[PDB]
Amino acid sequence: TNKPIVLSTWNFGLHANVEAWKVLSKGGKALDAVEKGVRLVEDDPTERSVGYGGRPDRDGRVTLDACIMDENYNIGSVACMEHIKNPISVARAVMEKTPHVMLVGDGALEFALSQGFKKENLLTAESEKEWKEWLKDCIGMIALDAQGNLSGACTTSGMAYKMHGRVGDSPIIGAGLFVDNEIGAATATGHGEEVIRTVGTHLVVELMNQGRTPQQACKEAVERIVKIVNRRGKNLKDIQVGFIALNKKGEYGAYCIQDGFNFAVHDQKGNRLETPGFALK
Amino acid sequence: SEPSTTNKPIVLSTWNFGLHANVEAWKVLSKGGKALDAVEKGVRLVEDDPTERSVGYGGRPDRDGRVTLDACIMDENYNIGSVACMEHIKNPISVARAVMEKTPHVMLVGDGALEFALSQGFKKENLLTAESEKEWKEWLKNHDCIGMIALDAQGNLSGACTTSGMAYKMHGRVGDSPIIGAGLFVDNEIGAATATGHGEEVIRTVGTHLVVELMNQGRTPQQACKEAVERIVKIVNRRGKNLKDIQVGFIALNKKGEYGAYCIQDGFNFAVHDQKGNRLETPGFALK
Ligand code: NA
Ligand code: NA
């Protein structure tokens, strides 16, 4: 087994991995590592697709989606939540502190406040400016820790200028994120509607369950999804879906419909940016 | 060549009230109509019924006395629509169908879902009946949803799921019913499945996507429902929980019109209407 190891999506995954590794390298829990990892990007107003600084919906409201899954089938999720900078941590509170696994809208905010989270104005001057001008994708992280336990976290401000109330894949278990401690974990990149449609990360993990490596599973999910896009009469150039994945042995994999995505991997070899295979050549 | 036997049209729905919801779906299916129209019409009957207290009008409120409704819908070509935690609209399944057909999104929640519904001509209505208000105030001091899946005369699958959610849930709580892959999943080249019960547990295990993938890899609909239930049973134990506290059922249909179901605990039936008639059937259960 190769452990610990953490993967996360996009260039900022490299920086998120560093924070995750501060936990993983000291023998801490995957759950804590992935929370710490993605909060880094939630916190950063120059990362405009996650948390603080996220581009608003078309009504100028910054609404955030996140979910988290630990090594023993515990889950939490918030969607379309406003004024709280660290939705992954509220999702973690939904998981640990309530008998529910998903809260949305005003109810998610009220819960957050009741747990001692603080309202903050998430719309930056920069985002407000660009929104008004307009009027005229996420971070996912999965890790295997020194105990051989998996966990993962996904957080986003969702599609810029979405309809108010729009929810993407990031807070939906089996779409944006899925973890089964006996199999593996996967988290998605791409058009949220399309990852929901195909239940993408549950598919990747079930393909690993069925005996595929993380790499084979990501590629086979994407190839199945490519055929569905065609069945739907759509142009593959208009659709992005991709996955990164980890199994219980610390093997990893990534594959997308289209070139141009990258993801960060940190293990005993250190932290680096790698690029997946892709279908649309 | 096509199958020697396909049982179509056919519609299945969860719980005893599925029997009369099936009659309404069959008005569409028996005339060669689309599975998508059939399953919408079928579940709207229950949404419309104030005496059905876990779906639509008359649904028991969250703990603050808001009736907030969840539904999703899926047709024969991976088109999907979903609303969740939506207030004041009696037929969330039809707003879900509008999300699917009329927007570039697949899920709206909360205020945004209501504003969209109003923009589409749905009418704001008071969904809290005197009876539900009475019970709620007192509280202060089975049939948890309807899922319906159908195979029409063309050989196409579609499904719908709609609920008012756990009674006296936290404000904003969403269960499995509006989540594609949890409460409902339909793939026209394999089969369809819809779920009922403790929504948290169906979300946890991505239940209907799992049932349909098990059919994909060769299980019959009943085999796939049963194996999914038994996975939930294993997970409940891994989590150190007591199975007695949990109910989940699945019903499932494949491309040939074969069907099946299975649940954790007894007392769950489903209704199936095909050309031979409308039947209330009782599946096996895990907790014996
Ligand atoms: Na940010
Ligand atoms: Na009702």
Side-chain angles (χ1 to χ4, degrees), chain A residues 1-135 137-281, chain B residues 1-140 142-288:
Chain A
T1 294
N2 182 29
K3 63 174 180 295
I5 176 172
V6 54
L7 272 68
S8 62
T9 57
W10 298 113
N11 309 61
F12 52 39
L14 202 67
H15 316 308
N17 282 8
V18 175
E19 300 302 311
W21 197 251
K22 288 173 183 175
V23 177
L24 293 173
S25 69
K26 304 190 183 67
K29 295 162 64 192
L31 178 63
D32 288 316
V34 301
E35 183 184 16
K36 185 188 183 60
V38 305
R39 280 176 60 102
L40 179 77
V41 181
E42 292 178 333
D43 277 352
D44 184 338
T46 70
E47 301 293 357
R48 309 290 302 301
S49 58
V50 184
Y52 179 32
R55 299 200 182 73
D57 66 29
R58 64 178 186 182
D59 296 323
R61 315 266 290 274
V62 180
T63 76
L64 305 190
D65 310 328
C67 72
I68 191 170
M69 188 154 0
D70 76 0
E71 77 294 340
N72 200 34
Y73 311 89
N74 302 127
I75 52 171
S77 171
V78 294
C80 197
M81 183 175 65
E82 281 173 274
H83 309 311
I84 306 301
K85 177 169 62 167
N86 299 291
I88 192 60
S89 297
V90 187
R92 181 171 181 166
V94 172
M95 181 169 71
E96 297 180 330
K97 302 296 166 60
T98 81
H100 296 138
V101 306
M102 186 175 197
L103 299 184
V104 312
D106 295 345
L109 172 61
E110 290 155 43
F111 175 63
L113 296 169
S114 79
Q115 297 296 299
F117 295 84
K118 297 306 185 198
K119 296 182 63 171
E120 294 183 88
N121 186 345
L122 304 185
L123 185 64
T124 55
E126 170 180 48
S127 291
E128 178 179 45
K129 189 159 192 286
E130 312 189 326
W131 166 59
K132 286 170 178 182
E133 308 185 307
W134 176 81
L135 289 166
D137 64 324
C138 73
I139 184 174
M141 175 178 277
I142 52 182
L144 177 67
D145 62 25
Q147 297 168 74
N149 291 331
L150 294 155
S151 296
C154 192
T155 176
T156 187
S157 56
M159 180 193 309
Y161 314 134
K162 58 196 180 187
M163 298 178 56
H164 181 69
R166 179 270 192 178
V167 174
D169 64 303
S170 296
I172 297 178
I173 295 295
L177 174 68
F178 192 70
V179 179
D180 185 313
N181 202 38
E182 291 305 306
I183 303 170
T187 189
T189 183
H191 292 97
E193 284 70 14
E194 300 310 319
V195 175
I196 291 176
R197 192 182 312 291
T198 61
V199 202
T201 53
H202 183 67
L203 173 59
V204 172
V205 174
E206 183 60 19
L207 296 175
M208 288 192 282
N209 191 20
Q210 298 174 201
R212 284 190 168 71
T213 66
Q215 184 58 39
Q216 292 173 332
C218 290
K219 176 175 187 168
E220 171 76 3
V222 163
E223 290 181 340
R224 289 177 47 166
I225 293 178
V226 170
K227 287 169 182 184
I228 287 164
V229 172
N230 181 63
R231 277 155 58 174
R232 290 165 51 70
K234 307 302 192 201
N235 194 133
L236 202 59
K237 202 75 177 181
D238 298 323
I239 297 186
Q240 175 63 304
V241 175
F243 305 106
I244 61 185
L246 209 42
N247 65 16
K248 192 70 167 175
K249 299 301 177 283
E251 289 170 287
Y252 66 92
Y255 201 88
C256 304
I257 296 172
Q258 298 197 51
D259 195 28
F261 172 65
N262 45 47
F263 64 96
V265 49
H266 199 326
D267 57 12
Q268 301 86 284
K269 286 187 62 158
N271 195 27
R272 65 277 186 180
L273 268 302
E274 284 175 31
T275 62
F278 59 91
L280 198 176
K281 299 174 181 306
Chain B
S1 302
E2 273 306 283
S4 301
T5 304
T6 303
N7 189 6
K8 60 167 174 169
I10 180 167
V11 55
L12 272 74
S13 53
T14 51
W15 301 107
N16 283 19
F17 57 23
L19 201 63
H20 58 274
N22 281 1
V23 178
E24 295 302 317
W26 195 252
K27 290 175 184 173
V28 177
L29 293 170
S30 66
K31 302 179 182 70
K34 291 156 64 176
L36 182 66
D37 293 315
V39 301
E40 178 186 21
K41 180 158 169 288
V43 304
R44 283 182 54 103
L45 178 71
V46 180
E47 291 180 333
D48 283 352
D49 186 341
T51 64
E52 284 304 334
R53 308 290 307 294
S54 291
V55 185
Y57 182 36
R60 298 195 187 75
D62 69 16
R63 64 179 182 188
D64 304 315
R66 312 183 195 73
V67 185
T68 70
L69 303 189
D70 309 324
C72 70
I73 194 170
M74 189 157 191
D75 74 355
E76 76 288 355
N77 206 27
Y78 270 90
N79 301 120
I80 49 173
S82 173
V83 298
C85 202
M86 180 181 60
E87 288 176 88
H88 302 139
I89 304 300
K90 185 169 313 183
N91 300 292
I93 191 65
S94 295
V95 189
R97 179 173 182 166
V99 171
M100 173 170 76
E101 294 179 341
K102 304 301 168 55
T103 80
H105 298 135
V106 297
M107 188 173 188
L108 300 182
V109 307
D111 298 339
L114 172 61
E115 176 176 68
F116 176 63
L118 296 174
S119 82
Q120 295 295 301
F122 290 92
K123 67 172 285 56
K124 213 169 174 169
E125 290 184 292
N126 181 12
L127 303 182
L128 182 71
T129 53
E131 167 180 55
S132 294
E133 179 179 46
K134 182 199 73 60
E135 284 181 34
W136 166 59
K137 288 172 176 179
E138 292 171 320
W139 177 78
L140 275 176
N142 300 349
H143 299 217
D144 60 285
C145 80
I146 183 166
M148 178 177 275
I149 52 182
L151 174 65
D152 59 35
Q154 286 158 268
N156 294 324
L157 290 162
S158 296
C161 190
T162 177
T163 190
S164 56
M166 182 178 115
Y168 313 127
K169 61 194 172 185
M170 298 182 61
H171 182 32
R173 177 279 188 174
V174 173
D176 66 303
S177 296
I179 302 189
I180 293 296
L184 176 68
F185 193 67
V186 180
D187 185 319
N188 203 36
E189 288 183 42
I190 305 161
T194 191
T196 193
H198 287 95
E200 283 71 14
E201 302 311 320
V202 176
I203 292 174
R204 202 185 300 293
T205 63
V206 201
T208 54
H209 181 71
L210 175 60
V211 172
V212 171
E213 187 53 15
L214 294 173
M215 290 191 287
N216 192 23
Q217 301 314 162
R219 266 163 260 258
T220 66
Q222 183 101 14
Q223 293 175 340
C225 186
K226 185 177 181 173
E227 173 177 344
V229 164
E230 293 176 339
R231 284 210 214 177
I232 291 179
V233 168
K234 285 166 191 294
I235 299 315
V236 163
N237 188 251
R238 281 179 220 160
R239 301 185 66 247
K241 302 294 176 187
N242 186 315
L243 197 61
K244 186 56 191 277
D245 299 321
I246 305 308
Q247 175 64 302
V248 172
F250 298 107
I251 60 180
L253 200 44
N254 65 22
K255 177 188 179 300
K256 298 178 76 280
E258 295 172 325
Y259 65 87
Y262 205 80
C263 56
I264 305 308
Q265 299 199 51
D266 69 351
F268 174 71
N269 304 135
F270 66 99
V272 50
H273 200 324
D274 55 21
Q275 298 248 281
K276 290 181 165 144
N278 195 24
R279 300 183 291 287
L280 188 64
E281 295 180 355
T282 300
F285 49 96
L287 174 5
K288 304 194 176 69

PDB file of all heavy atoms in Angstrom, chain B residues 177-203:
ATOM      1  N   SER B 177     -35.216  11.773  -2.088  1.00  0.00           N
ATOM      2  CA  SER B 177     -36.251  11.783  -3.115  1.00  0.00           C
ATOM      3  C   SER B 177     -35.970  12.710  -4.305  1.00  0.00           C
ATOM      4  O   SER B 177     -36.401  12.391  -5.421  1.00  0.00           O
ATOM      5  CB  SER B 177     -37.606  12.137  -2.476  1.00  0.00           C
ATOM      6  OG  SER B 177     -37.978  11.112  -1.559  1.00  0.00           O
ATOM      7  N   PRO B 178     -35.239  13.846  -4.112  1.00  0.00           N
ATOM      8  CA  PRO B 178     -34.988  14.701  -5.273  1.00  0.00           C
ATOM      9  C   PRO B 178     -33.583  14.510  -5.846  1.00  0.00           C
ATOM     10  O   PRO B 178     -33.159  15.276  -6.717  1.00  0.00           O
ATOM     11  CB  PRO B 178     -35.142  16.107  -4.702  1.00  0.00           C
ATOM     12  CG  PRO B 178     -34.359  15.944  -3.367  1.00  0.00           C
ATOM     13  CD  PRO B 178     -34.805  14.530  -2.871  1.00  0.00           C
ATOM     14  N   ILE B 179     -32.849  13.524  -5.337  1.00  0.00           N
ATOM     15  CA  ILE B 179     -31.462  13.347  -5.739  1.00  0.00           C
ATOM     16  C   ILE B 179     -31.330  12.190  -6.747  1.00  0.00           C
ATOM     17  O   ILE B 179     -31.647  11.035  -6.434  1.00  0.00           O
ATOM     18  CB  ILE B 179     -30.593  13.083  -4.511  1.00  0.00           C
ATOM     19  CG1 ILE B 179     -30.737  14.267  -3.531  1.00  0.00           C
ATOM     20  CG2 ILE B 179     -29.133  12.821  -4.956  1.00  0.00           C
ATOM     21  CD1 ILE B 179     -29.773  14.261  -2.367  1.00  0.00           C
ATOM     22  N   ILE B 180     -30.886  12.524  -7.960  1.00  0.00           N
ATOM     23  CA  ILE B 180     -30.713  11.534  -9.028  1.00  0.00           C
ATOM     24  C   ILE B 180     -29.599  10.580  -8.618  1.00  0.00           C
ATOM     25  O   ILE B 180     -28.523  11.019  -8.194  1.00  0.00           O
ATOM     26  CB  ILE B 180     -30.357  12.234 -10.364  1.00  0.00           C
ATOM     27  CG1 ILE B 180     -31.565  13.071 -10.837  1.00  0.00           C
ATOM     28  CG2 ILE B 180     -29.969  11.203 -11.453  1.00  0.00           C
ATOM     29  CD1 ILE B 180     -32.801  12.285 -11.164  1.00  0.00           C
ATOM     30  N   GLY B 181     -29.865   9.288  -8.718  1.00  0.00           N
ATOM     31  CA  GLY B 181     -28.915   8.287  -8.236  1.00  0.00           C
ATOM     32  C   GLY B 181     -29.208   7.825  -6.820  1.00  0.00           C
ATOM     33  O   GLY B 181     -28.757   6.746  -6.402  1.00  0.00           O
ATOM     34  N   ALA B 182     -29.951   8.629  -6.063  1.00  0.00           N
ATOM     35  CA  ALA B 182     -30.362   8.205  -4.733  1.00  0.00           C
ATOM     36  C   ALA B 182     -31.825   7.775  -4.771  1.00  0.00           C
ATOM     37  O   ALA B 182     -32.093   6.574  -4.837  1.00  0.00           O
ATOM     38  CB  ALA B 182     -30.133   9.326  -3.691  1.00  0.00           C
ATOM     39  N   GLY B 183     -32.757   8.734  -4.728  1.00  0.00           N
ATOM     40  CA  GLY B 183     -34.186   8.414  -4.802  1.00  0.00           C
ATOM     41  C   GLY B 183     -34.681   7.823  -6.118  1.00  0.00           C
ATOM     42  O   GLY B 183     -35.711   7.127  -6.178  1.00  0.00           O
ATOM     43  N   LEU B 184     -33.963   8.100  -7.184  1.00  0.00           N
ATOM     44  CA  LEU B 184     -34.433   7.758  -8.527  1.00  0.00           C
ATOM     45  C   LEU B 184     -33.276   7.650  -9.502  1.00  0.00           C
ATOM     46  O   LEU B 184     -32.394   8.510  -9.527  1.00  0.00           O
ATOM     47  CB  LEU B 184     -35.412   8.836  -9.030  1.00  0.00           C
ATOM     48  CG  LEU B 184     -35.886   8.635 -10.469  1.00  0.00           C
ATOM     49  CD1 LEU B 184     -36.792   7.386 -10.577  1.00  0.00           C
ATOM     50  CD2 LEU B 184     -36.674   9.945 -10.911  1.00  0.00           C
ATOM     51  N   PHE B 185     -33.277   6.601 -10.327  1.00  0.00           N
ATOM     52  CA  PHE B 185     -32.352   6.541 -11.436  1.00  0.00           C
ATOM     53  C   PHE B 185     -32.969   5.763 -12.590  1.00  0.00           C
ATOM     54  O   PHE B 185     -33.613   4.738 -12.373  1.00  0.00           O
ATOM     55  CB  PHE B 185     -31.027   5.870 -11.027  1.00  0.00           C
ATOM     56  CG  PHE B 185     -29.938   6.076 -12.047  1.00  0.00           C
ATOM     57  CD1 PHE B 185     -29.421   7.369 -12.264  1.00  0.00           C
ATOM     58  CD2 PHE B 185     -29.504   5.019 -12.872  1.00  0.00           C
ATOM     59  CE1 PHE B 185     -28.507   7.620 -13.281  1.00  0.00           C
ATOM     60  CE2 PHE B 185     -28.579   5.258 -13.906  1.00  0.00           C
ATOM     61  CZ  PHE B 185     -28.078   6.568 -14.115  1.00  0.00           C
ATOM     62  N   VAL B 186     -32.778   6.269 -13.816  1.00  0.00           N
ATOM     63  CA  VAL B 186     -33.341   5.629 -15.023  1.00  0.00           C
ATOM     64  C   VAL B 186     -32.288   5.614 -16.129  1.00  0.00           C
ATOM     65  O   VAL B 186     -31.824   6.669 -16.548  1.00  0.00           O
ATOM     66  CB  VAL B 186     -34.572   6.426 -15.596  1.00  0.00           C
ATOM     67  CG1 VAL B 186     -35.118   5.705 -16.842  1.00  0.00           C
ATOM     68  CG2 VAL B 186     -35.677   6.589 -14.507  1.00  0.00           C
ATOM     69  N   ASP B 187     -31.948   4.433 -16.633  1.00  0.00           N
ATOM     70  CA  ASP B 187     -31.109   4.340 -17.830  1.00  0.00           C
ATOM     71  C   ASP B 187     -31.854   3.476 -18.864  1.00  0.00           C
ATOM     72  O   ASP B 187     -32.154   2.324 -18.607  1.00  0.00           O
ATOM     73  CB  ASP B 187     -29.768   3.691 -17.446  1.00  0.00           C
ATOM     74  CG  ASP B 187     -28.783   3.664 -18.579  1.00  0.00           C
ATOM     75  OD1 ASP B 187     -29.219   3.378 -19.701  1.00  0.00           O
ATOM     76  OD2 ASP B 187     -27.575   3.919 -18.345  1.00  0.00           O
ATOM     77  N   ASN B 188     -32.180   4.036 -20.023  1.00  0.00           N
ATOM     78  CA  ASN B 188     -33.093   3.357 -20.938  1.00  0.00           C
ATOM     79  C   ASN B 188     -32.509   2.063 -21.515  1.00  0.00           C
ATOM     80  O   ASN B 188     -33.254   1.185 -21.988  1.00  0.00           O
ATOM     81  CB  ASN B 188     -33.485   4.294 -22.078  1.00  0.00           C
ATOM     82  CG  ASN B 188     -34.800   3.902 -22.714  1.00  0.00           C
ATOM     83  OD1 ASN B 188     -35.716   3.449 -22.031  1.00  0.00           O
ATOM     84  ND2 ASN B 188     -34.905   4.075 -24.028  1.00  0.00           N
ATOM     85  N   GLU B 189     -31.187   1.927 -21.490  1.00  0.00           N
ATOM     86  CA  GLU B 189     -30.583   0.692 -21.982  1.00  0.00           C
ATOM     87  C   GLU B 189     -30.408  -0.379 -20.910  1.00  0.00           C
ATOM     88  O   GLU B 189     -29.838  -1.437 -21.181  1.00  0.00           O
ATOM     89  CB  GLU B 189     -29.244   0.993 -22.657  1.00  0.00           C
ATOM     90  CG  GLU B 189     -29.478   1.696 -24.010  1.00  0.00           C
ATOM     91  CD  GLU B 189     -28.209   1.962 -24.788  1.00  0.00           C
ATOM     92  OE1 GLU B 189     -27.330   1.068 -24.834  1.00  0.00           O
ATOM     93  OE2 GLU B 189     -28.094   3.070 -25.375  1.00  0.00           O
ATOM     94  N   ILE B 190     -30.890  -0.110 -19.698  1.00  0.00           N
ATOM     95  CA  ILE B 190     -30.734  -1.088 -18.600  1.00  0.00           C
ATOM     96  C   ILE B 190     -32.048  -1.269 -17.834  1.00  0.00           C
ATOM     97  O   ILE B 190     -32.598  -2.394 -17.734  1.00  0.00           O
ATOM     98  CB  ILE B 190     -29.640  -0.632 -17.573  1.00  0.00           C
ATOM     99  CG1 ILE B 190     -28.307  -0.375 -18.295  1.00  0.00           C
ATOM    100  CG2 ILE B 190     -29.534  -1.669 -16.442  1.00  0.00           C
ATOM    101  CD1 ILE B 190     -27.322   0.504 -17.491  1.00  0.00           C
ATOM    102  N   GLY B 191     -32.526  -0.170 -17.253  1.00  0.00           N
ATOM    103  CA  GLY B 191     -33.595  -0.276 -16.262  1.00  0.00           C
ATOM    104  C   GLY B 191     -33.744   0.996 -15.425  1.00  0.00           C
ATOM    105  O   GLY B 191     -33.012   1.971 -15.613  1.00  0.00           O
ATOM    106  N   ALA B 192     -34.666   0.950 -14.476  1.00  0.00           N
ATOM    107  CA  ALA B 192     -34.998   2.094 -13.635  1.00  0.00           C
ATOM    108  C   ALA B 192     -35.234   1.566 -12.235  1.00  0.00           C
ATOM    109  O   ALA B 192     -35.647   0.411 -12.055  1.00  0.00           O
ATOM    110  CB  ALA B 192     -36.280   2.750 -14.136  1.00  0.00           C
ATOM    111  N   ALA B 193     -35.035   2.429 -11.250  1.00  0.00           N
ATOM    112  CA  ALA B 193     -35.275   2.051  -9.858  1.00  0.00           C
ATOM    113  C   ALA B 193     -35.672   3.330  -9.116  1.00  0.00           C
ATOM    114  O   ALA B 193     -35.214   4.430  -9.453  1.00  0.00           O
ATOM    115  CB  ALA B 193     -33.992   1.458  -9.234  1.00  0.00           C
ATOM    116  N   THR B 194     -36.532   3.187  -8.120  1.00  0.00           N
ATOM    117  CA  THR B 194     -36.813   4.324  -7.268  1.00  0.00           C
ATOM    118  C   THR B 194     -36.842   3.800  -5.829  1.00  0.00           C
ATOM    119  O   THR B 194     -36.999   2.600  -5.620  1.00  0.00           O
ATOM    120  CB  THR B 194     -38.146   5.012  -7.717  1.00  0.00           C
ATOM    121  OG1 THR B 194     -38.278   6.273  -7.054  1.00  0.00           O
ATOM    122  CG2 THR B 194     -39.350   4.161  -7.379  1.00  0.00           C
ATOM    123  N   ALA B 195     -36.637   4.674  -4.841  1.00  0.00           N
ATOM    124  CA  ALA B 195     -36.384   4.227  -3.468  1.00  0.00           C
ATOM    125  C   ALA B 195     -37.410   4.879  -2.542  1.00  0.00           C
ATOM    126  O   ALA B 195     -38.008   5.907  -2.887  1.00  0.00           O
ATOM    127  CB  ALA B 195     -34.975   4.627  -3.016  1.00  0.00           C
ATOM    128  N   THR B 196     -37.595   4.294  -1.359  1.00  0.00           N
ATOM    129  CA  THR B 196     -38.380   4.941  -0.307  1.00  0.00           C
ATOM    130  C   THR B 196     -37.711   4.629   1.032  1.00  0.00           C
ATOM    131  O   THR B 196     -36.917   3.681   1.136  1.00  0.00           O
ATOM    132  CB  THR B 196     -39.843   4.386  -0.333  1.00  0.00           C
ATOM    133  OG1 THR B 196     -40.707   5.209   0.469  1.00  0.00           O
ATOM    134  CG2 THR B 196     -39.858   2.942   0.185  1.00  0.00           C
ATOM    135  N   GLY B 197     -38.034   5.423   2.055  1.00  0.00           N
ATOM    136  CA  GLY B 197     -37.602   5.098   3.395  1.00  0.00           C
ATOM    137  C   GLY B 197     -36.778   6.227   3.968  1.00  0.00           C
ATOM    138  O   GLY B 197     -36.912   7.393   3.545  1.00  0.00           O
ATOM    139  N   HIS B 198     -35.921   5.884   4.921  1.00  0.00           N
ATOM    140  CA  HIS B 198     -35.060   6.868   5.562  1.00  0.00           C
ATOM    141  C   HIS B 198     -34.077   7.435   4.546  1.00  0.00           C
ATOM    142  O   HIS B 198     -33.137   6.748   4.146  1.00  0.00           O
ATOM    143  CB  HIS B 198     -34.299   6.235   6.730  1.00  0.00           C
ATOM    144  CG  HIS B 198     -35.157   5.974   7.922  1.00  0.00           C
ATOM    145  ND1 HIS B 198     -35.758   4.755   8.158  1.00  0.00           N
ATOM    146  CD2 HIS B 198     -35.564   6.793   8.921  1.00  0.00           C
ATOM    147  CE1 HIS B 198     -36.496   4.834   9.247  1.00  0.00           C
ATOM    148  NE2 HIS B 198     -36.397   6.059   9.732  1.00  0.00           N
ATOM    149  N   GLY B 199     -34.328   8.678   4.122  1.00  0.00           N
ATOM    150  CA  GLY B 199     -33.631   9.237   2.975  1.00  0.00           C
ATOM    151  C   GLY B 199     -32.127   9.324   3.176  1.00  0.00           C
ATOM    152  O   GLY B 199     -31.365   9.090   2.243  1.00  0.00           O
ATOM    153  N   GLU B 200     -31.699   9.645   4.392  1.00  0.00           N
ATOM    154  CA  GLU B 200     -30.271   9.719   4.707  1.00  0.00           C
ATOM    155  C   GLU B 200     -29.554   8.441   4.270  1.00  0.00           C
ATOM    156  O   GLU B 200     -28.429   8.486   3.772  1.00  0.00           O
ATOM    157  CB  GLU B 200     -30.073   9.949   6.212  1.00  0.00           C
ATOM    158  CG  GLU B 200     -30.336  11.417   6.652  1.00  0.00           C
ATOM    159  CD  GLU B 200     -31.803  11.847   6.625  1.00  0.00           C
ATOM    160  OE1 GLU B 200     -32.722  10.982   6.530  1.00  0.00           O
ATOM    161  OE2 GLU B 200     -32.028  13.086   6.721  1.00  0.00           O
ATOM    162  N   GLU B 201     -30.211   7.304   4.440  1.00  0.00           N
ATOM    163  CA  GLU B 201     -29.565   6.009   4.202  1.00  0.00           C
ATOM    164  C   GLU B 201     -29.520   5.657   2.715  1.00  0.00           C
ATOM    165  O   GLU B 201     -28.619   4.956   2.253  1.00  0.00           O
ATOM    166  CB  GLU B 201     -30.301   4.892   4.958  1.00  0.00           C
ATOM    167  CG  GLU B 201     -30.384   5.090   6.497  1.00  0.00           C
ATOM    168  CD  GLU B 201     -29.026   5.438   7.122  1.00  0.00           C
ATOM    169  OE1 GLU B 201     -28.007   4.857   6.719  1.00  0.00           O
ATOM    170  OE2 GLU B 201     -28.988   6.297   8.023  1.00  0.00           O
ATOM    171  N   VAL B 202     -30.501   6.138   1.964  1.00  0.00           N
ATOM    172  CA  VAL B 202     -30.490   5.959   0.517  1.00  0.00           C
ATOM    173  C   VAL B 202     -29.450   6.879  -0.141  1.00  0.00           C
ATOM    174  O   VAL B 202     -28.812   6.499  -1.129  1.00  0.00           O
ATOM    175  CB  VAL B 202     -31.903   6.254  -0.059  1.00  0.00           C
ATOM    176  CG1 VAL B 202     -31.886   6.161  -1.588  1.00  0.00           C
ATOM    177  CG2 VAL B 202     -32.909   5.240   0.498  1.00  0.00           C
ATOM    178  N   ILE B 203     -29.272   8.082   0.402  1.00  0.00           N
ATOM    179  CA  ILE B 203     -28.224   8.992  -0.082  1.00  0.00           C
ATOM    180  C   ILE B 203     -26.835   8.381   0.158  1.00  0.00           C
ATOM    181  O   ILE B 203     -25.984   8.369  -0.740  1.00  0.00           O
ATOM    182  CB  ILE B 203     -28.309  10.374   0.621  1.00  0.00           C
ATOM    183  CG1 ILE B 203     -29.584  11.088   0.181  1.00  0.00           C
ATOM    184  CG2 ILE B 203     -27.050  11.246   0.259  1.00  0.00           C
ATOM    185  CD1 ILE B 203     -29.829  12.392   0.918  1.00  0.00           C
TER     186      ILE B 203
END
